[PDB]
Scaffold this active site. Structure first.
Site, PDB file in Angstrom:
ATOM      1  CG  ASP A 242       0.380  -4.286   2.984  1.00 30.14           C
ATOM      2  OD1 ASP A 242       0.720  -3.712   1.929  1.00 30.14           O
ATOM      3  OD2 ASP A 242       0.072  -3.664   4.020  1.00 30.14           O
TER       4      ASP A 242
ATOM      5  CG  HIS B  11      -0.435   0.150   2.506  1.00 29.69           C
ATOM      6  ND1 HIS B  11       0.099  -0.904   3.217  1.00 29.69           N
ATOM      7  CD2 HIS B  11      -0.302   1.242   3.294  1.00 29.69           C
ATOM      8  CE1 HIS B  11       0.535  -0.466   4.384  1.00 29.69           C
ATOM      9  NE2 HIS B  11       0.303   0.833   4.455  1.00 29.69           N
TER      10      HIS B  11
ATOM     11  N   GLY C 271       5.199   0.091   6.089  1.00 28.56           N
ATOM     12  CA  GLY C 271       6.325  -0.307   5.265  1.00 28.56           C
ATOM     13  C   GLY C 271       7.598  -0.505   6.057  1.00 28.56           C
TER      14      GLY C 271
END
Ligand code: CA
Ligand code: CA
Ligand code: NA
Lengths: 58, 223
Positions: B84, B40, B178
């Site tokens: 993800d 994302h 992240g």
């Protein structure tokens, strides 16, 4: 139908700090807010121009 | 990072900042040309900032390198948030030193209760907004899959794991995505999502890196 331009800005569950625009009906203008990166609602734009074109005058 | 502490300048050498005109996500350096982050966090014109502490001021140990490639996992689902993970190639190889270093990938998954280090430049408030200048750190334990599923009914996949404290007050938050979750010197997680930040009974959810080691190695080698 409900105007998506009148919905409060939605950050979402993801943890990014992405700056997006939303139409603030109370103030009558496109403002910045923090988007988390996923599950965006429609009152979420990548630029002030996109926001004004879609929600201007709502 | 909510409820954490100031890491100290360059004490987390593998932590990088993803910049698109401003800091929007974190990442982890795995070798001189590759960074692991969240799917994302895919954005246009990414510039990876290495050797950073105060992200708002040039301190002298920074290396700003543009992303030459941004490979999102082919099975990433933007609705469920499954898979993800994203790999970013640096346009030019980063100069490795004591302040810019790679973090090892895991050889096996981490067990519940294992203490890990979570870091980032994200929001430091559970309710409200406050973004730090310097890198923040948090020690938090890996939680059981049963507790994770109980906290988030019908949302936890086999590629996700919870970490943190159920009482609330300590968690990763917006701007940390992240970034790394390092346990015993291995990158076990990627900051992914959660219900708010540092809320009671709502620990942070992270991408389970140990499930992607083979994919990471092969993808890096094929690009
Ligand atoms: Ca504004
Ligand atoms: Ca700096
Ligand atoms: Na500093």
């Amino acid at each position: 139908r409900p105007d998506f331009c009148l919905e409060p800005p939605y950050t979402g569950p993801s943890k990014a700090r992405i700056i997006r625009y939303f139409y603030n009906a109370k103030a009558g203008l496109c403002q910045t807010f923090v988007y988390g990166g996923s599950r965006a609602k429609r009152n979420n734009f990548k630029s002030a121009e996109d926001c004004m074109r879609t929600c201007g005058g709502a | 990072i909510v409820g954490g502490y100031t890491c100290g300048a360059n004490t987390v050498p593998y932590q990088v900042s993803l910049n698109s005109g401003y800091h929007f996500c974190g990442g982890s350096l795995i070798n001189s040309q590759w960074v692991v982050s969240a799917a994302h966090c895919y954005k246009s014109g990414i510039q990876v900032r290495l050797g950073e502490d105060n992200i708002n001021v040039v301190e002298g140990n920074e290396q700003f390198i543009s992303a030459s490639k941004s490979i999102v996992h082919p099975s990433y689902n933007s609705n469920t948030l499954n898979n993800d993970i994203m790999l970013i190639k640096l346009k030019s190889a980063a100069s490795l030193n004591s302040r810019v270093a790679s973090i090892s990938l895991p050889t096996s998954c981490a067990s519940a209760g294992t203490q890990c280090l979570i870091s980032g430049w994200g929001n430091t408030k559970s309710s409200g907004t406050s973004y730090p200048d310097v890198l923040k750190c948090l020690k938090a334990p890996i939680l059981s899959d049963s507790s994770c599923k109980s906290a988030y009914p019908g949302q936890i996949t086999s590629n996700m794991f919870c970490a943190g404290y159920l009482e609330g007050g300590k968690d990763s938050c917006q701007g940390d995505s992240g970034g790394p979750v390092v346990c015993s010197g291995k990158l076990q997680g990627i900051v992914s999502w959660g219900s708010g930040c540092a809320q009671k009974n709502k620990p942070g959810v992270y991408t389970k890196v140990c499930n992607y080691v083979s994919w990471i190695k092969q993808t890096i080698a094929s690009n």
